[PDB]
Amino acid sequence: MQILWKKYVKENFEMNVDECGIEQGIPGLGYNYEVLKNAVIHYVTKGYGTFKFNGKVYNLKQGDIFILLKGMQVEYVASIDDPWEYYWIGFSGSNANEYLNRTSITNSCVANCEENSKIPQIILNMCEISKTYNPSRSDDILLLKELYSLLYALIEEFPKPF
Amino acid sequence: MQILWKKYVKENFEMNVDECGIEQGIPGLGYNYEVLKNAVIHYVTKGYGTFKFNGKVYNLKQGDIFILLKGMQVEYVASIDDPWEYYWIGFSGSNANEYLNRTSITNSCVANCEENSKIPQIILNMCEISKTYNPSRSDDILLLKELYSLLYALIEEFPKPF
Numbered sequence: 593m594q595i596l597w598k599k600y601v602k603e604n605f606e607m608n609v610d611e612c613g614i615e616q617g618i619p620g621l622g623y624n625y626e627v628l629k630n631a632v633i634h635y636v637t638k639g640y641g642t643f644k645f646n647g648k649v650y651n652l653k654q655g656d657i658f659i660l661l662k663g664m665q666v667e668y669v670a671s672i673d674d675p676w677e678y679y680w681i682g683f684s685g686s687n688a689n690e691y692l693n694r695t696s697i698t699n700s701c702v703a704n705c706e707e708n709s710k711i712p713q714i715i716l717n718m719c720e721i722s723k724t725y726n727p728s729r730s731d732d733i734l735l736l737k738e739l740y741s742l743l744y745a746l747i748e749e750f751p752k753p754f
Numbered sequence: 755m756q757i758l759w760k761k762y763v764k765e766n767f768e769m770n771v772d773e774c775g776i777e778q779g780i781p782g783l784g785y786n787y788e789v790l791k792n793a794v795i796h797y798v799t800k801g802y803g804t805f806k807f808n809g810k811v812y813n814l815k816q817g818d819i820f821i822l823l824k825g826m827q828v829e830y831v832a833s834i835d836d837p838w839e840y841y842w843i844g845f846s847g848s849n850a851n852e853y854l855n856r857t858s859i860t861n862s863c864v865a866n867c868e869e870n871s872k873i874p875q876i877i878l879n880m881c882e883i884s885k886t887y888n889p890s891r892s893d894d895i896l897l898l899k900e901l902y903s904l905l906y907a908l909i910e911e912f913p914k915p916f
């Protein structure tokens with residue numbers, strides 16, 4: 593089951609944080625579905641698992657990212673021996689979708705974070721904020737700041753040629 | 755004229771950077787008008803000047819901020835002896851206006867930045883980006899990130915009671 597699964601209302605249409613999650617996988621179990629949500633970025637924090645999309649089978653580990661986009665038919669399953677933990681951010685909006693088309697990550701939907709990547713700290717920080725989300729303390733502003741930082745970081749580290 | 759006056763298109767309606775500017779005042783000169791723009795925050799980087807609004811006359815210096823909001827009848831004039839330089843960010847959107855109403859700044863429209871304030875480096879950084887604005891290098895994402903940071907910093911340092 594899920595250590596964290598915060599679902600937010602879809603009140604913004606340029607940029608919206610839809611949900612933030614942490615899941616420790618159960619060995620040999622996962623998910624097989626057509627993605628309904630706009631976009632969901634997963635960061636693998638430990639263990640191993642497999643991501644299956646368009647006939648390709650990726651063996652992923654700590655440091656790896658995979659992104660689910662609306663309409664993708666996907667399967668992602670924790671390793672029997674050493675099941676992954678992943679953090680995820682679900683997001684949407686017209687700006688979000690324009691910025692995703694500026695990164696090479698949306699071609700294969702998988703990447704590996706370099707040693708000094710800014711992406712892991714942003715995703716971990718959004719999940720931390722989500723645990724005690726308080727809009728009256730302006731956590732809503734902070735999550736949006738962090739989502740703009742995340743998409744900037746994806747384009748910096750995984751650019752499409754100009 | 756102005757050291758910098760970058761005007762942006764109004765493409766976003768939840769959160770939008772309208773313009774960024776730097777102006778070195780000429781002694782005893784400035785502006786007297788009804789504000790048409792949504793919101794414009796000014797940060798005084800050098801010198802002295804006066805801000806007149808709603809019968810009150812404020813003598814401002816380095817560290818001070820004043821905010822122009824749509825419909826305010828205002829006058830702001832550089833000191834005869836030591837004329838101010840100010841940096842300004844013009845912004846708009848439904849989210850921007852909701853966040854401004856979580857700050858105590860929007861009644862008097864004047865404040866002083868504390869020694870450790872995060873506000874000065876955000877405003878200076880937005881103006882620096884504006885000098886060589888390149889959307890193809892995703893400067894548009896970075897300006898929006900910085901505007902969310904600015905509004906978060908205003909609420910943190912100038913909160914309305916909860």
Ligand SMILES: OC[C@H]1O[C@@H](O[C@@H]2[C@@H](CO)O[C@](O)(CO)[C@H]2O)[C@H](O)[C@@H](O)[C@H]1O
Pocket residue numbers: 613615623625627628629632680682
């Ligand atoms: O959205 C990311 C999360 O997705 C969860 O899987 C859900 C599946 C089956 O329960 O059905 C959806 O609701 C379809 O939208 C999915 O969100 C995973 O269990 C999470 O681990 C996480 O990947």
Ligand SMILES: OC[C@H]1O[C@@H](O[C@@H]2[C@@H](CO)O[C@](O)(CO)[C@H]2O)[C@H](O)[C@@H](O)[C@H]1O
Pocket residue numbers: 775777785786787789790791794842844
């Ligand atoms: O918006 C902030 C800037 O305002 C400029 O003043 C302009 C006056 C000119 O009388 O008319 C407007 O266009 C009406 O919206 C103003 O923007 C100042 O010259 C700048 O220094 C800056 O404060």
